[PDB]
Amino acid sequence: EGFAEEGAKAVYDRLKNDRQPYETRAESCAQYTIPSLFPKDSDNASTDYTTPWQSVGARGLNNLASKLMLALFPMQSWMKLTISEYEAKNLLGDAEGLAKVDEGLSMVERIIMNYIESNSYRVTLFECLKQLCVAGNALLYLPEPEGYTPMKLYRLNSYVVQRDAFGNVLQIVTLDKIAFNALPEDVRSQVEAAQGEQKEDAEIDVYTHVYLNEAGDGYSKYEEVAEEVVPGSEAEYPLEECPYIPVRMVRIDGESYGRSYVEEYLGDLKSLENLQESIVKMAMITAKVIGLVDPAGITQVRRLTAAQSGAFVPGRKQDIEFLQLEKSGDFTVAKNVSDTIEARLSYAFMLNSVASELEDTLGGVYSILSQELQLPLVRVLLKQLQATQQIPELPKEAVEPTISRGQDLDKLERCIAAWSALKALEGDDDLNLANLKLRIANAIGLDTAGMLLTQEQKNALMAQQGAQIATQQGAAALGQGMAAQATASPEAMAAAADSVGMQPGM
Amino acid sequence: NVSDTIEARLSYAFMLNSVASELEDTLGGVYSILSQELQLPLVRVLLKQLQATQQIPELPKEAVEPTISRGQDLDKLERCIAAWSALKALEGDDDLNLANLKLRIANAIGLDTAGMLLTQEQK
Amino acid sequence: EGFAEEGAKAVYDRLKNDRQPYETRAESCAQYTIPSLFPKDSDNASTDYTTPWQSVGARGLNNLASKLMLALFPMQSWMKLTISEYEAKNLL
Amino acid sequence: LEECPYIPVRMVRIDGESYGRSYVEEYLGDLKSLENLQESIVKMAMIT
Numbered sequence: 185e186g187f188a189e190e191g192a193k194a195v196y197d198r199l200k201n202d203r204q205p206y207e208t209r210a211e212s213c214a215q216y217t218i219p220s221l222f223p224k225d226s227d228n229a230s231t232d233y234t235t236p237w238q239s240v241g242a243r244g245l246n247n248l249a250s251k252l253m254l255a256l257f258p259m260q261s262w263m264k265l266t267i268s269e270y271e272a273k274n275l276l277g278d279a280e281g282l283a284k285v286d287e288g289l290s291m292v293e294r295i296i297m298n299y300i301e302s303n304s305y306r307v308t309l310f311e312c313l314k315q316l317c318v319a320g321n322a323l324l325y326l327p328e329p330e331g332y333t334p335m336k337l338y339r340l341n342s343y344v345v346q347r348d349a350f351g352n353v354l355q356i357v358t359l360d361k362i363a364f365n366a367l368p369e370d371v372r373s374q375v376e377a378a379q380g381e382q383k384e385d386a387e388i389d390v391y392t393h394v395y396l397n398e399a400g401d402g403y404s405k406y407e408e409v410a411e412e413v414v415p416g417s418e419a420e421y422p423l424e425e426c427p428y429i430p431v432r433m434v435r436i437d438g439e440s441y442g443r444s445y446v447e448e449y450l451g452d453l454k455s456l457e458n459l460q461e462s463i464v465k466m467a468m469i470t471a472k473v474i475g476l477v478d479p480a481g482i483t484q485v486r487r488l489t490a491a492q493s494g495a496f497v498p499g500r501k502q503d504i505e506f507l508q509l510e511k512s513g514d515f516t517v518a519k520n521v522s523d524t525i526e527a528r529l530s531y532a533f534m535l536n537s538v539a540s541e542l543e544d545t546l547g548g549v550y551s552i553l554s555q556e557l558q559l560p561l562v563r564v565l566l567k568q569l570q571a572t573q574q575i576p577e578l579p580k581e582a583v584e585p586t587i588s589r590g591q592d593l594d595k596l597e598r599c600i601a602a603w604s605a606l607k608a609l610e611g612d613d614d615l616n617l618a619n620l621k622l623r624i625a626n627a628i629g630l631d632t633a634g635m636l637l638t639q640e641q642k643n644a645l646m647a648q649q650g651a652q653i654a655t656q657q658g659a660a661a662l663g664q665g666m667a668a669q670a671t672a673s674p675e676a677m678a679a680a681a682d683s684v685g686m687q688p689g690m
Numbered sequence: 691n692v693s694d695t696i697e698a699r700l701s702y703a704f705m706l707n708s709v710a711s712e713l714e715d716t717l718g719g720v721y722s723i724l725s726q727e728l729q730l731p732l733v734r735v736l737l738k739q740l741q742a743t744q745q746i747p748e749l750p751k752e753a754v755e756p757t758i759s760r761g762q763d764l765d766k767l768e769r770c771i772a773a774w775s776a777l778k779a780l781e782g783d784d785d786l787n788l789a790n791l792k793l794r795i796a797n798a799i800g801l802d803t804a805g806m807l808l809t810q811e812q813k
Numbered sequence: 814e815g816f817a818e819e820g821a822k823a824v825y826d827r828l829k830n831d832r833q834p835y836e837t838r839a840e841s842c843a844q845y846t847i848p849s850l851f852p853k854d855s856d857n858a859s860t861d862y863t864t865p866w867q868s869v870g871a872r873g874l875n876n877l878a879s880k881l882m883l884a885l886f887p888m889q890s891w892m893k894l895t896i897s898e899y900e901a902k903n904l905l
Numbered sequence: 906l907e908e909c910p911y912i913p914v915r916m917v918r919i920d921g922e923s924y925g926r927s928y929v930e931e932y933l934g935d936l937k938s939l940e941n942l943q944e945s946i947v948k949m950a951m952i953t
Contacts, residue, residue, distance in 0.1 A: 220917065220926055229922055230834040235934035239699040242931070243716070250715040260762045261800055280790060286797045291898060294800070298895055302754035307726040310719060332754070332907065334726070339920065361921075365815060384815045464938055467692035471945035473952070515691075536712060575899055593798035596791070597773065603786070604779050618785045634790045642784060648813070693942040696935055697869050703932050704873030705880040720877075720916075720928070721885050728914040729885065733892050738908040753894050760890050802898070835924045842929040845936040867943040870936050874929065 187355050192393035192408045196357040199344040206441045207341055210319035213446040216453040217241035222318050225341045237461040240526050241446075241453050244533030248445070249314045251534040256550055256558065257309055260297065261589045263562050265289040265582050269631070272581075279634035289582065292575050296565055299574065303334050311337050312431065312557070320444030321432040323358070326564050328427075329572050340441075345430045347440040355395035356428050361387040370415050378410040394421075394428050425567040429560040433552055445549070449532045452525050459522040466509065474507040550588070558586040599628045721759075729757040762800075770799040846870035 187195075207225070214222035218241070219233035236242070256262070267289065272282060300306070308324065315322040315337070323338040323345070343358040364372060364382045371390075375382055382388070390409055397404040403426050407417035421427065432442025446453070477485055481503030488504075491497055527537075534542050562584050569575045602624045609615060618636075625632045637645070670680035678688045698708075705713050733755050740746045773795045780786060789807075796803045817824070836854070843851035847870070848862035865871065885891070915925025929936070 220919065220931060223919065229831060235932055243702060246716050246719055250718045283790060283793050287803050290797050290800060291802065295898055301756040302895060304726040304730060307722050310722045464692055467942055471942060473949060574897060589798060589800060596795055596798055600776050600780065607780065621785050635787050637784060637787045641787065693939060693946065696939045700869050700873060700932060700935055700939065704877045706873055706876055717880060717884060721881055723916055723918060724885060731912040735908045735910055752900060753896055755892055756895060757892050759884055759887065760893060831923060838930055839927060842927050842933055845940060846929055865940060866947065867939045869939060
């Protein structure tokens with residue numbers, strides 16, 4: 185155990201110090217956007233999260249998380265399963281062989297979406313995205329499929345990860361606090377013989393350590409509760425398919441964690457926070473009303489307060505004056521700059537004031553997340569569903585690109601429209617229509633495999649069409665022939681009635 | 691002016707108009723937790739309760755419940771029907787394999803293509 | 814009965830202390846939006862709930878509850894029943 | 906666990922807590938400031 189000489193708990197404590205700078209930035213970003221989203225690890229139930237004086241941080245965070253959710257995980261088919269066309273065509277034959285295979289690949293895709301929707305991954309994925317925006321580096325773990333199993337999300341101050349400057353992951357440690365009764369019996373008995381008698385609801389720290397095993401590529405996983413491994417949790421995972429996938433946005437090389445998206449605009453949020461605070465402070469000063477009456481005057485304010493809704497009392501208007509806040513010129517200057525910073529922050533997130541500019545900017549934000557989050561999630565699900573026989577055993581030659589179907593529908597519809605225009609030229613003996621159809625498909629970019637009718641396939645169409653005409657014309661002649669024969673001559677009419685059981689005459 | 695500003699930002703925080711395409715997206719994140727927290731457990735309890743009282747037939751225990759807010763089933767059928775109707779204008783053409791194109795269209799749309807084709811016996 | 818050695822009433826009385834911060838925070842929230850929603854457990858029939866000086870809290874809270882209800886539980890079929898396609902094809 | 910009649914539902918859930926947090930609590934402070942500003946405005950009208 186090269187990476188597990190000292191133990192899972194010791195690794196977590198040692199590597200926690202490197203996580204400290206990222207936790208502090210996460211709390212600072214949360215304090216301005218949404219304080220409740222990332223508490224500072226000391227906030228108990230009796231802590232109140234005061235709303236920031238500016239609301240663009242909360243409004244922008246919610247909008248960006250939802251816009252990312254729609255683009256990353258749309259309603260249907262954000263991933264595709266593709267087989268190598270050259271190798272698939274060689275092993276198989278042609279025509280519908282490639283089309284039949286795509287049916288199985290498409291059928292597997294529909295299962296993956298159904299599994300994701302049935303286990304409510306979208307709820308956890310949305311929670312992960314919000315943590316990515318504020319903290320920027322969440323961890324999500326996919327447990328083995330057993331009935332209804334939702335994946336777990338680990339916040340930044342719940343796990344720890346060590347990466348190299350090359351970017352590869354060395355080890356991951358997660359910390360969980362499960363009550364004594366909620367633990368399994370084998371673990372529960374181990375704690376009984378390790379820390380003595382335990383309270384029913386006592387929180388027990390459980391560390392799971394996933395580290396790069398020595399020599400061959402892989403990951404070794406084990407769980408320890410008090411100071412030693414449980415009776416059994418040793419699990420081995422390959423590099424591509426590991427349930428613990430640490431997803432980060434805005435990744436910087438040489439760092440073990442990512443940086444949140446808010447950090448790129450935290451300075452503007454701080455500047456807007458101060459300006460918005462002072463503007464509200466001025467209004468509260470304005471809210472107070474004070475009457476400054478000249479002591480050298482003759483008006484007695486005892487008569488004004490003791491009077492009724494209408495009254496004539498001695499006094500002068502010049503004696504009574506009201507203190508009102510000045511700095512009307514300041515208020516516009518502070519308001520103008522506050523509006524300016526709000527405008528640039530509204531564009532930083534996906535907030536309208538343009539329509540064709542926010543999508544293009546959004547395109548680069550989630551490009552990292554497709555490789556960091558979308559791709560590993562599919563890879564783990566593909567292996568896990570094969571093990572539990574949820575999908576047929578893949579031949580290991582299928583590669584999945586995450587597309588945010590695809591161009592196949594567009595190519596087919598575009599190619600059909602071109603053929604429909606070419607249909608206006610039918611009946612022409614000068615032009616080779618069959619060659620032009622092939623040229624059109626090549627220009628669009630279709631595979632042109634099986635779309636043309638072979639001579640054997642043309643015979644089948646004529647045979648099926650010919651059988652219809654024989655049946656259609658045969659039925660009319662047979663029905664009219666039988667009726668004519670039955671109805672000819674009065675005595676044959678009676679014989680025909682006898683055949684069906686009827687009696688001549690009523 | 692300050693009172694109006696605070697009202698304006700509080701109006702957006704709730705689902706109050708001043709925009710149409712900006713409040714649904716904010717709303718989408720509010721009830722994402724509630725689907726798993728409230729909708730899903732309620733259906734699971736009801737299904738067992740109705741099974742016990744013979745209100746619904748005994749399920750084979752292999753059925754899973756997604757809370758959607760049908761779904762893409764109708765849209766996929768309508769999308770491929772329109773695409774197939776476009777392929778209707780190309781009928782009578784002996785160069786193109788119409789049957790293969792129908793299969794390719796359904797795969798592009800995403801239908802299961804299970805039983806949608808007429809076998810020789812069904813013909 | 815490890816969780817029920819002391820009894821149901823004793824557990825409720827003990828755990829009531831941890832509920833106090835949430836009850837107090839709920840009364841404050843209700844005081845500004847709609848005072849009638851969350852009375853403070855000491856309000857009998859002879860208590861009048863004075864209207865908040867601003868109407869944004871009441872208008873927003875009612876709107877958000879209705880919008881959530883409409884989206885969460887629409888007119889028909891906010892759930893569906895799905896069978897595993899691979900398993901169903903094999904059995905049938 | 907899957908089917909229990911008593912289902913405690915909470916919105917805005919914070920890990921490590923036995924209860925959820927209300928949605929109004931996030932914007933409670935802005936409501937307090939609006940309440941104070943709206944209060945003084947009406948009081949000025951009654952003086953008027």
